[PDB]
Amino acid sequence: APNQALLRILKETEFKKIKVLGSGAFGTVYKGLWIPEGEKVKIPVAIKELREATSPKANKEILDEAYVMASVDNPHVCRLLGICLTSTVQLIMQLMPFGCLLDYVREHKDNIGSQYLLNWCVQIAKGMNYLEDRRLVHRDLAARNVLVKTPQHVKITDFGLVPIKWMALESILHRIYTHQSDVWSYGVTVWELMTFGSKPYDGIPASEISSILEKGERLPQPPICTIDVYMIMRKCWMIDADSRPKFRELIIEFSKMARDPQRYLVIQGDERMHLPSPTDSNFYRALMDEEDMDDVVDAD
Amino acid sequence: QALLRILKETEFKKIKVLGSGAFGTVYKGLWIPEGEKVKIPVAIKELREATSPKANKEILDEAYVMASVDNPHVCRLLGICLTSTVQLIMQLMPFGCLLDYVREHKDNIGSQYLLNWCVQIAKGMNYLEDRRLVHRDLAARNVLVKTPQHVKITDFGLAKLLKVPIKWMALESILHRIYTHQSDVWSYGVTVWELMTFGSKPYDGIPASEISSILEKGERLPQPPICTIDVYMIMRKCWMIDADSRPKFRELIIEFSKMARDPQRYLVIQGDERMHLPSPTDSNFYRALMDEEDMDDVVDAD
Numbered sequence: 001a002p003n004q005a006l007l008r009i010l011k012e013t014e015f016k017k018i019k020v021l022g023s024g025a026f027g028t029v030y031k032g033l034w035i036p037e038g039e040k041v042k043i044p045v046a047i048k049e050l051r052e053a054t055s056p057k058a059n060k061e062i063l064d065e066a067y068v069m070a071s072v073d074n075p076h077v078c079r080l081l082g083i084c085l086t087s088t089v090q091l092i093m094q095l096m097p098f099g100c101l102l103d104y105v106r107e108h109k110d111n112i113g114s115q116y117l118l119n120w121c122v123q124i125a126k127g128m129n130y131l132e133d134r135r136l137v138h139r140d141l142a143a144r145n146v147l148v149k150t151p152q153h154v155k156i157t158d159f160g161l162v163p164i165k166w167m168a169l170e171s172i173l174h175r176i177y178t179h180q181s182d183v184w185s186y187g188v189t190v191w192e193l194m195t196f197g198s199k200p201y202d203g204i205p206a207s208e209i210s211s212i213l214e215k216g217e218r219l220p221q222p223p224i225c226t227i228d229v230y231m232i233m234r235k236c237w238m239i240d241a242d243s244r245p246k247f248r249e250l251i252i253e254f255s256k257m258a259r260d261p262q263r264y265l266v267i268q269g270d271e272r273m274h275l276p277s278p279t280d281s282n283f284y285r286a287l288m289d290e291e292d293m294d295d296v297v298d299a300d
Numbered sequence: 301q302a303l304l305r306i307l308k309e310t311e312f313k314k315i316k317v318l319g320s321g322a323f324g325t326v327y328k329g330l331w332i333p334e335g336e337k338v339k340i341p342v343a344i345k346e347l348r349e350a351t352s353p354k355a356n357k358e359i360l361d362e363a364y365v366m367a368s369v370d371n372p373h374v375c376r377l378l379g380i381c382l383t384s385t386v387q388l389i390m391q392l393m394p395f396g397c398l399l400d401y402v403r404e405h406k407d408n409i410g411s412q413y414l415l416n417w418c419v420q421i422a423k424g425m426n427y428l429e430d431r432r433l434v435h436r437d438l439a440a441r442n443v444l445v446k447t448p449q450h451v452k453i454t455d456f457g458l459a460k461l462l463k464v465p466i467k468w469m470a471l472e473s474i475l476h477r478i479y480t481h482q483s484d485v486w487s488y489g490v491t492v493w494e495l496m497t498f499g500s501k502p503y504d505g506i507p508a509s510e511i512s513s514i515l516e517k518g519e520r521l522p523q524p525p526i527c528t529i530d531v532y533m534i535m536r537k538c539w540m541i542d543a544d545s546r547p548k549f550r551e552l553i554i555e556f557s558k559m560a561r562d563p564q565r566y567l568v569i570q571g572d573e574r575m576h577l578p579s580p581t582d583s584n585f586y587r588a589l590m591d592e593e594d595m596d597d598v599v600d601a602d
């Protein structure tokens with residue numbers, strides 16, 4: 001039973017859209033402003049407007065999901081904050097000024113250190129492991145669905161509710177979605193990071209992806225990945241869903257790797273790239289990230 | 301140590317003036333982290349008088365203390381920039397100071413908000429006392445609104461870093477510039493008075509030079525129309541000539557907490573029934589958007 005107090009019902013008068021941030025299969029994301037009743041302040045939020053207008057009875061099913069998505073509580077998962085049931089439904093969550101991780105790593109190619117990359121792999125695995133523990137399946141994990149709270153803190157979004165090149169073969173062939181097909185997409189998500197945001201299977205029609213996968217072909221080793229990192233990615237893309245790693249294991253493996261980061265990723269000038277000092281880390285949190293969180297795995 | 305960030309002029313920029321006081325000017329600002337493209341809103345206080353390189357060592361010693369203050373009801377210094385001026389960086393509070401907030405919501409604030417504000421301010425002041433720090437400039441203008449449910453004392457120590465708030469000051473502070481936790485308690489009483497009157501000016505139109513003589517005559521700020529006698533009694537006890545005869549912040553937490561539990565027994569406010577602490581729903585929203593900080597549960601009515 002989801003605590004429905006966690007899902008605020010918004011009135012259309014309480015908020016305004018002010019900028020488009022992007023779009024995807026299900027809707028259009030806006031940066032918006034929430035103006036609390038009787039106050040003078042404008043509070044930035046992110047708003048997703050769904051693609052299709054809905055009936056009151058369809059709105060019921062949307063509301064049931066919304067109650068569930070408002071109920072998650074983990075430092076590496078975003079929760080839904082509110083909902084507006086206009087003709088076409090609008091959804092409100094926290095605005096991330098750093099955007100999604102996909103855009104972040106593209107803007108910082110190739111000037112992201114190994115420490116950051118491997119730590120993001122841990123945080124995304126923790127977030128996913130939590131979803132598994134709540135018995136939620138993501139169905140759409142990708143770098144565009146990992147949000148950057150601060151560069152040291154990423155959070156999974158848009159879970160629980162096609163992107164062929166992120167999908168496990170059984171999902172492509174049978175529309176089966178499990179925690180283990182989420183693990184496949186984890187693999188692709190890790191590939192996106194390690195390539196600083198390249199497009200998976202670029203140039204290949206979605207049409208042919210299932211065929212290519214059956215031939216045993218896969219995304220290529222990114223040039224910064226040592227063979228153990230690559231091996232992990234390949235294990236995520238095994239035909240047999242049960243042979244793939246569990247998110248629990250992925251937390252452990254990547255945490256180990258984060259302890260000796262230059263041993264597992266090879267990045268030119270890695271020595272010189274920023275590893276966040278305590279001073280910088282504390283500033284970011286005091287400024288824009290006060291939530292309770294874990295400690296980041298640092299190099300021994 | 302690692303609590304005070306030293307910034308360079310290149311990574312921040314002042315935008316708009318928010319206000320000025322005795323020691324400097326406050327700006328709505330932007331923090332532009334090196335190599336990032338995001339602009340993070342901050343507040344910047346530039347002190348009035350330029351700095352020596354030797355007066356820099358003084359400022360930093362104190363800044364490091366201000367950055368060490370970790371409590372949900374006190375603001376900490378986040379960063380500093382030392383040029384010809386001294387610039388101090390802290391979290392921007394969009395809601396502004398408590399003084400402004402009570403004026404703007406004048407007569408539309410419930411007893412539960414007012415009494416809980418008194419609890420929170422008392423907790424934050426008690427924390428400074430436990431750390432052996434004196435504020436020296438407590439007033440409603442130096443309490444900030446994080447959300448309407450969450451207020452935080454600001455600008456402590458800044459008075460030690462360097463026009464005189466006579467009408468907030470204890471008598472021994474006026475006459476001898478003695479500042480103690482017990483002189484902070486005097487100012488706390490004044491602060492509470494500011495809130496209970498929805499932001500009236502204390503001793504309005506009475507010359508500052510006359511204040512010490514007024515106080516010596518046993519005269520004090522008047523009972524706000526919404527305060528019952530027990531609440532006015534606490535305030536009057538904060539303004540006792542004998543400092544050790546004033547309440548301790550510790551006690552003030554206990555008293556106002558007691559009162560927040562039965563708020564209509566202690567404040568008489570017209571329309572108070574249609575004003576209430578936020579639903580959990582509404583409180584959840586506010587916290588997710590504005591206040592991820594941990595903080596004690598707000599005292600609710602029995």
Ligand SMILES: Nc1ncnc2c1ncn2[C@@H]1O[C@H](COP(=O)(O)OP(=O)(O)NP(=O)(O)O)[C@@H](O)[C@H]1O
Binds near residue numbers: 029093158
């Ligand atoms: N809370 C948010 N804060 C800041 N930016 C966001 C937020 N949510 C989404 N965005 C950005 O808006 C874009 C569109 O989001 P979305 O509508 O969910 O499509 P997508 O996830 O990128 N692709 P799809 O998998 O088809 O849904 C995202 O890629 C982000 O760049």
Ligand SMILES: Nc1ncnc2c1ncn2[C@@H]1O[C@H](COP(=O)(O)OP(=O)(O)NP(=O)(O)O)[C@@H](O)[C@H]1O
Binds near residue numbers: 324325326441465
């Ligand atoms: N972090 C902050 N966020 C938003 N507004 C602030 C902040 N700090 C101060 N202000 C406002 O900036 C203005 C100036 O504050 P300040 O320079 O400290 O003088 P003052 O507190 O009003 N009087 P005093 O400090 O006692 O001399 C006031 O309007 C404050 O409400």
Ligand SMILES: O=C(Nc1nccs1)[C@@H](c1ccccc1)N1Cc2ccccc2C1=O
Binds near residue numbers: 159
């Ligand atoms: O709202 C979400 N994304 C946003 N991006 C910007 C503003 S909102 C997303 C989400 C899922 C899980 C956690 C947080 C958000 N939802 C919720 C939800 C409830 C009912 C029906 C569809 C959706 C949906 O897509």
Ligand SMILES: [Mg+2]
Binds near residue numbers: 024157
């Ligand atoms: Mg998305």
Ligand SMILES: [Mg+2]
Binds near residue numbers: 321442454455
């Ligand atoms: Mg001030």
